[model samples]
Target: MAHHHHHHVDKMLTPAFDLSQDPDFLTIAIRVSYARVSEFDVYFEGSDFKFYAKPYFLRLTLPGRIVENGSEQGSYDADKGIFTIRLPKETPGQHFEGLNMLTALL
Candidate 1:
């Protein structure tokens, strides 16, 4: 039997925080949504980090029916004060959905 599926994508940015100085680490939370049967890959981007850096880039994948919710945690380099996170995909659809990046200055 062949099955059909529908998908939806959404992005929301949360409040940002400052971690300049002691214990220099900033954090922000973002929310994403999908509908029916779908798979998605989400990437977060920051203002001050290198996209090529492995530590700075993160990827989350949502498999159809098998998985749904996912979360990521990232930090800025305190010494260098470099803002860092993941990046978003260009297209949002059945193969790969949407992405949201919550940036924090530290």
Candidate 2:
């Protein structure tokens, strides 16, 4: 009899923070040039993400994956520098892959 081996494919997970199960939301907070909401805009969608800066042609492709059916929202903390984006999850009380590494990744 010949020996047989089984191989498994590894899944790549993007970095994320504040992976909450209760409210089902993710956090993307970064310090930018201006704190004004009009100056900075955050976008998040299933399998797609973008952060746009007004008065400047700045576009950033975020690193992370979100549920396709979920929605997103954001808020600014009077920071002359940063924007905090909130992404709601599709399934409530559930989490995503690589979630345990959230703190370290942040």
Candidate 3:
């Protein structure tokens, strides 16, 4: 006798990620192993951010606001499948609360 299951299916899902910050910058690194294309739609303003790719979708409302002054940047590492973003904080020296609480950040 043998048993088999068929409920499992491939579906869109969230990727693994990490968020960190410095005195004046907040860094968000998203790992998308399934993303084969280099094109990614990323947006950030004030306290909100959104990221999208073929197999990755992420949205978050940060505790600290972000500012864009020709300083926001991002890079994708193909080897590690990680998309890293650096955004300057609206107010320097302000510590973003709850960076560890990802659920609340969302």
Give the winner by lDDT. Answer: 3
lDDT of 3 by residue, 1-106 (tens): 9998787323456778789999989999999888856798888889988888866778888998999798988899999989999999999999999897875233
Per-model TM against the reference = 0.21, 0.47, 0.82
Please state the error at residue 38 of candidate 2 in Å: 3.8
Instruction: Give one digit per residue, the lDDT tens place, for model 1 in 1-106.
Output: 9999998442222222222211222232222221111222233333232122322322223221112123333444445444433322222232322223324332
RMSD of each: 17.2, 16.9, 8.8
Per-residue lDDT over 1-106 for candidate 2, one digit per residue giving the tens place of the 0 to 100 score: 9999998432222222333333477666655454323565545565355555543222333334556443566665554454667676655555455643434221
Per-candidate local distance difference test: 0.29, 0.49, 0.84
TM-score ranking from best to worst? 3, 2, 1
By how many angstroms RMSD does model 2 differ from the true structure?
16.9
How many clashes does the backbone of model 2 have? 1
Give the lDDT ranking, best first: 3, 2, 1
Q: Deviation in angstroms for 58 in model 3?
A: 0.1
User: Which candidate ranks first by TM-score, i.e. highest?
Assistant: 3
Clashing pairs in 1: 43-87, 44-86, 44-87, 45-86
lDDT of 1 at 78: 42
Clashing pairs in 2: 32-81
